[PDB]
Structure formats: C-alpha cells, structure tokens
C-alpha cells in the first residue's frame, strides 16, 4: 500500500512538462514535483525498511529520465538538486542492497553519469562526484569499468583536444581510491601514476585541478615510496621553463611531496631538485622566490638539508661553498 504510493510518486516525477501559454499551471506542476521529491527524500532518510525490491528499478528510472539529458552549450536546479539528493540518500541507506541494484545500475548508467561530469555547474559536478564515489564503493563489479572510463576521459583531455570541466572532481574521487589501495601496487596503478597523472601537469588548464592532482600524486608516494624518483624527475621535466607564476603551483606540490618523502629516497633526487629550487630563489618574480624561500619554514625539510648540507649548500649558495 505505502509501497505503491512510493512507486506512484516516483513515476509522477518521471513526467516532464511545459506550459507555453499557462505560467500559472506550470508553477503548480513544478511545485507538486518539488513537493513529491522532498517528501521522498524525508521518507527514505528517516524511515527503515522502506526500500523494497520493486522500487529499485523505479528509483533508477526516475533518476535516468530526469538527469540523463542533452547538456547545453542548470536553470531547473531546484528540481535537479532534489533528484541528486534523493538518489544519494537511496545509495547511502542501510537497506540498500547492491546485489539487487546491480541489475539496474550497470555500465550504461555509469557511462551516462560520466557524461554529466562535463556540466558547467559546480553544484552539479559536486553531486555527481559524491554519487560516483558511492557507486564505486558499493559496486565491486563496477570498480574496474569505472577506472577504465575515467582513464579514457583523461587521455582525451591530455592528448586529444577534448576539454573537460570535471577533471578536478574526478581526481578528487581518485584520491579517495588511491588512499585505500592494496599493499603491493598493481602494475596498472603504477602505469596510471606515470602515464596519466604526471602528464596532467603538462596541460595549460592545470590551475583548475592542480590541488586535486597534487593530492593524488602525494597519496601514491604515501603507499609505495619507490615511485618518488620518477615523480620528482617528471615534475622537474614538466617544470615551467619560462619564469611564470605557474611555478608557485609546482613549488606547492613539491613541498607537499617533501613532507612525506623517505630520507633514502630524498637523496636520489635532492640534487636536481635544489638546482631548480636555486633558480626559483633567483627568480625575477617575487612570488616565486617568496614561495621557494618558504621551504625553510619546514622542519622536516631542514633535517633533510642539514643531514645533506654537503651536497645541497654548494648548489644553493655556490658563492659561499664548493663541491
């Protein structure tokens, strides 16, 4: 009975309407739909044992009909926000059984969900980020396919001309994945760190997703510290050869790497690091030099410097020291 009304209101929200010559009836309909959604958000959030098997296709269908749309070059956000909200509470519910939902949340669904990441609305990409993070976490049989399709988006962003507004949100999800990796890093993961994450520093629009990219690179080094050398050497490779404020970005990422670096791995790249660091101190741009000089306010770096002053000091101040 109450299950029947749930399905009714769900299907009721599958009706897209428009009144070209009746703005008053249009507001009534949008209010009814907004109300029904809010009622269902409150319903599945604070009630237990309400998510029965027959409603699973009803929810996924309601989400698909509303969200899987053809993106413009939104305005109806009060409705879209509720749909995202409702679907999230649905996924996060303790009554949620992925073994039943895997029938309806498949690869095509995940694929269409990723299309929406190209949205220009920061609010929407945030909901999508959370939603895809839930699906990856509760659907073990989708994890492999999701990583594959995200890897494709990056490859088309770096190499191909395909720009993407959701690069940051995707990296934020990836950081959540990397942090929970197994003990020995799979070869595909190491390749991903090197063939994908590092060339992401090459793209011109780095400013948008660099904080998220830096976190991913750091998390990779927190797992396997064997990867510290090819990462650092790559950052020095992709380093802005021309003195520009973009160096501040790299200096920030480079200090965050040094915070979690192994002393034995530090010495493997301490020379080409401080050669570049010396150039930054000598930069015509004050902001770059100011940022590089801030390295000395880091206690752990000092320990690495002091215990390696025989190799570092000649590079930083060649006027005062010799090798």
């Amino acid at each position: 009975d109450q299950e029947k009304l749930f399905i009714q209101k769900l299907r009721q929200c599958c009706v897209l309407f428009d009144f070209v010559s009746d703005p008053l009836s249009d507001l009534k309909w949008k209010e009814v739909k907004r109300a029904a959604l809010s009622e269902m958000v409150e319903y599945i959030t604070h009630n237990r044992n309400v998510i029965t098997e027959p409603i699973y296709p009803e929810v996924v269908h309601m989400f698909a009909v509303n969200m899987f749309r053809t993106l413009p070059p939104e305005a109806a956000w009060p409705h879209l926000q509720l749909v995202y909200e409702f679907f999230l509470r649905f996924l996060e519910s303790p009554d949620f059984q992925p073994n039943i939902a895997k029938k309806y949340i498949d690869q095509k669904f995940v694929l269409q969900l990723l299309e929406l990441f190209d949205s220009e609305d920061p609010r929407e990409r945030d909901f999508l980020k959370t939603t895809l993070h839930r699906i990856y976490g509760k659907f073990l049989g989708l994890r492999a396919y999701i990583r594959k399709q995200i890897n494709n988006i990056f490859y088309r962003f770096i190499y191909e001309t395909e720009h993407h507004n959701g690069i940051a949100e995707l990296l934020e999800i990836l950081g959540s994945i990397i942090n929970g990796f197994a003990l020995p890093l799979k070869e595909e993961h190491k390749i991903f760190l090197l063939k994908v994450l590092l060339p992401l520093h090459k793209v011109k629009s780095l400013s948008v997703y660099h904080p998220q990219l830096a976190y991913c690179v750091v998390q990779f080094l927190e797992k396997d510290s064997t990867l510290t050398e090819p990462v650092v050497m790559a950052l020095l490779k992709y380093w802005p050869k021309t003195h520009s404020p973009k160096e501040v970005m790299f200096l920030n990422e480079l200090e965050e790497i040094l915070d979690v670096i192994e002393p034995s791995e530090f010495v493997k790249i301490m020379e080409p690091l401080f050669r570049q660091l010396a150039k930054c101190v000598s930069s015509p741009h004050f902001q770059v030099a100011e940022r590089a000089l801030y390295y000395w306010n880091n206690e752990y770096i000092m320990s690495l410097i002091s215990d390696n002053a025989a190799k570092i000091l000649p590079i930083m101040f060649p006027s005062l020291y010799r090798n």
Partner: peptide
C-alpha cells in the same frame, strides 16, 4: 568534507 577512503577489494 573530503571523500572517505575506498578500500581496494577483489571482485
């Protein structure tokens, strides 16, 4: 509110 870690598994 940063996303909670997702522990890698086998399936």
């Amino acid at each position: 509110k940063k996303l909670s870690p997702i522990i890698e598994d086998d399936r």
